[PDB]
Write a protein that binds this ligand. Structure first.
Ligand SMILES: CCCCCCCC(=O)CC(=O)N[C@H]1CCOC1=O
Ligand SMILES: CCCCCCCC(=O)CC(=O)N[C@H]1CCOC1=O
Lengths: 162, 162
């Protein structure tokens, strides 16, 4: 946890975060951050190992307005699991189809709301065989994730905000 | 935690928040929240069972501007433990000495930063003989408190202001 805070720069910070996520049994992560009052989602600060094709397509298609995890983040400080039922609109249906093709089926997103108005998300995706297995897994590590997201946010904003 | 989310009104929500903190070892607590950019701390939505003399005295001589925990809250999302490591100035000396007289020797403060810009603090005080035991009491449930502060924040911001 405290290693995040000590890491000099983005690159080593990112590596620490990815490894910590890997330890817990997640295969993909995204840490994404925007400053206060900003809605420039396509130029957010992004770290992690999401597929670059997904990231580019997402930004090009403006999926930040479509991704149900992102609207949720703008509205809440509580985690959102990537349950089928968060994908409610036709476009979110297609979003899910496309996210699945990129390996992003099971996971959750922890909203980030930093001390200086930063808005963001920390998503963790797990490769699982079914929704029963995935959810039960995420539920096991959730208290750890909960502390992790705020440490990530404070240190991560700290390399971004300054 | 969901029993908090379902709370209809402030009084009802307050009782369950007080009960839960109490169940966790914290006989004194303060949930205080401001809307976006409200620096008038005496305007803040306030629940908990801090001694009323302390609160009114606090909200009148601008102890919010002296309290090291509030300074921290405007800069961090991470918890701050109440200790001389944070009370070090002379103006912060007597703050602690006075907080001590009111029974607030040991505790911690979870900064609050809600999704719509809300600013505030959830503070838990614990009764203990010494700081070693005090820290044990707090660190043992810190993951639970971490979840509780965000649950309190989301539900709370929706009752205070909505
Ligand atoms: C506020 C920061 C800007 C947003 C960066 C992109 C946010 C996300 O990509 C959220 C996220 O992890 N969504 C997941 C949900 C299934 O597919 C995804 O890509
Ligand atoms: C943003 C909220 C506006 C003012 C709310 C008061 C917050 C606090 O009272 C912080 C707090 O709990 N300080 C602790 C430290 C020892 O005595 C106290 O009263």
């Amino acid at each position: 946890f405290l290693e995040l805070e000590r890491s000099s720069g983005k690159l080593e910070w990112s590596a620490i975060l990815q490894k910590m996520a890997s330890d817990l049994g997640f295969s993909k992560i995204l840490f994404g951050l925007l400053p206060k009052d900003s809605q420039d989602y396509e130029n957010a600060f992004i770290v992690g190992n999401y597929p670059a094709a997904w990231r580019e397509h997402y930004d090009r298609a403006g999926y930040a307005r479509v991704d149900p995890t992102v609207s949720h983040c703008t509205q809440s400080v509580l985690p959102i699991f990537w349950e089928p039922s968060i994908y409610q609109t036709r476009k979110q249906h297609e979003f899910f189809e496309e996210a699945s093709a990129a390996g992003l089926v099971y996971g959750l997103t922890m909203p980030l709301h930093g001390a200086r108005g930063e808005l963001g998300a920390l998503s963790f995706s797990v490769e699982a065989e079914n929704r029963a297995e995935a959810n039960r897994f995420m539920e096991s590590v959730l208290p750890t994730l909960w502390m992790l997201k705020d440490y990530a946010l404070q240190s991560g904003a700290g390399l971004a905000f300054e």
